[PDB]
Amino acid sequence: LIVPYNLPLPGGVVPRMLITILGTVKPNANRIALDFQRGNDVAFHFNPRFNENNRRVIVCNTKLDNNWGREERQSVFPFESGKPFKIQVLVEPDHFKVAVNDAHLLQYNHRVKKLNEISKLGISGDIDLTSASYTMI
Ligand SMILES: OC[C@H]1O[C@@H](O[C@H]2[C@H](O)[C@@H](O)[C@H](O)O[C@@H]2CO)[C@H](O)[C@@H](O)[C@H]1O
Ligand SMILES: [Cl-]
Numbered sequence: 494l495i496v497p498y499n500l501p502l503p504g505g506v507v508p509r510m511l512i513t514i515l516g517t518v519k520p521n522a523n524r525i526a527l528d529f530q531r532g533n534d535v536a537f538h539f540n541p542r543f544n545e546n547n548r549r550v551i552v553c554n555t556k557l558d559n560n561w562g563r564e565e566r567q568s569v570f571p572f573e574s575g576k577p578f579k580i581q582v583l584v585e586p587d588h589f590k591v592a593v594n595d596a597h598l599l600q601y602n603h604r605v606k607k608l609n610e611i612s613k614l615g616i617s618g619d620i621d622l623t624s625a626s627y628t629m630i
Pocket of ligand 1: 540554
């Protein structure tokens with residue numbers, strides 16, 4: 494698949510929806526980004542950074558009216574340059590739950606409450622993208 498990739502989420506997200514992203518991190522990767530969009534707003538931005546001041550960190554945030562909010566940062570970093578990965582985002586009633594390579598990584602409390610209007614997922618960054626899909630569990 495071509496990156497950046499736009500995956501429509503028809504009718505928005507709903508609890509029990511599972512989004513699975515398969516790809517490979519490029520050897521000299523700097524960033525990965527998943528952007529769950531509500532129009533121009535970003536309900537949930539998931540942003541692994543491979544070199545923020547020579548540390549690897551995951552930054553999560555929400556963008557409202559073109560303004561970023563308070564960042565939530567996770568120092569646990571399961572990605573590795575050059576290696577294949579699986580990201581799974583499970584929508585639960587109160588949070589997005591993210592697992593990488595079948596291991597729980599983090600939860601992100603819903604700041605954007607109109608889940609049915611979060612209708613696009615943008616996938617970008619230094620990856621080869623193999624598959625992006627969703628299903629109901
Ligand atoms: O919060 C997600 C958002 O971060 C922006 O970068 C921030 C950076 O994380 C922060 O340390 C600095 O003080 O401000 C920057 C600008 O708000 C990224 O530019 C953006 O792409 C998102 O990743
Ligand atoms: Cl809202």
